């Protein structure tokens, strides 16, 4: 499949932030 996964309940997990500063600003360690 090619569609994105969508998540509206969980916070951004820091494990996916790579080197994106937007991600790191809002993530949580889960």
């Amino acid at each position, epitope marked *: 499949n090619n569609d*994105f996964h*969508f*998540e*509206v309940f969980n916070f951004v997990p820091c494990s996916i932030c790579s080197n994106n500063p*937007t991600c790191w600003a*809002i993530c949580k360690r889960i």
Partner: antibody
Amino acid sequence: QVQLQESGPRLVKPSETLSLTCTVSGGSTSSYFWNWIRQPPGKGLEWIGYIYGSGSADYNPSLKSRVTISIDTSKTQFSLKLTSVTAADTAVYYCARSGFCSDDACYRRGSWFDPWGQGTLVTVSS
Amino acid sequence: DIQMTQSPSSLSASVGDRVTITCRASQSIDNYLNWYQQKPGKAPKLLIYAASGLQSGVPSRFSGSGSGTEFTLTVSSLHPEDFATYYCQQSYSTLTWTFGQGTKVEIKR
């Protein structure tokens, strides 16, 4: 630059349906979350609802019974439909994007509204 | 439901004054508080994201502080072009994001 633009009728009779479309350029509706927000003249801002993906949507409870948001098959447009309007629905209506997207996942919680459309005034009167 | 209480409603200040606006959330929202600036007849423009991130393109005289329930937007030195209405906005709720009532900043001269 992802840019947003609202369009639709500027005058709606009471009890009829208010409809607007937001056109997205430089981007696609197949990622991120697409929002509608309104502001009555001289008042504050009220979030209306959002849509994403294949067409999953959810709504402000103060309006849920009267509001539907839909996503178009070109994947460059989304639309607001608001029924049973009264003069209380007179307002400037904005569309806006929200959410953070990585390569394969888009998260809404803790994000913000950016970019915004220009906003269009809609007047409910007979 | 999460309500934001923004104070004050209105303020007048001189060029070069330090201005502070406060926003209180009805429950804890961690750092997920955003600030916008709206000039008359225009869409709100994002100034601060996630409580203290300074949005690209915004001058550093704007800054945000706080976490939990008490947040502050500060203009270190007011400029004439800072005349606007400022709004906080919480993105912690899973459903309804909400704004404060706004703070109209007028320039005294």
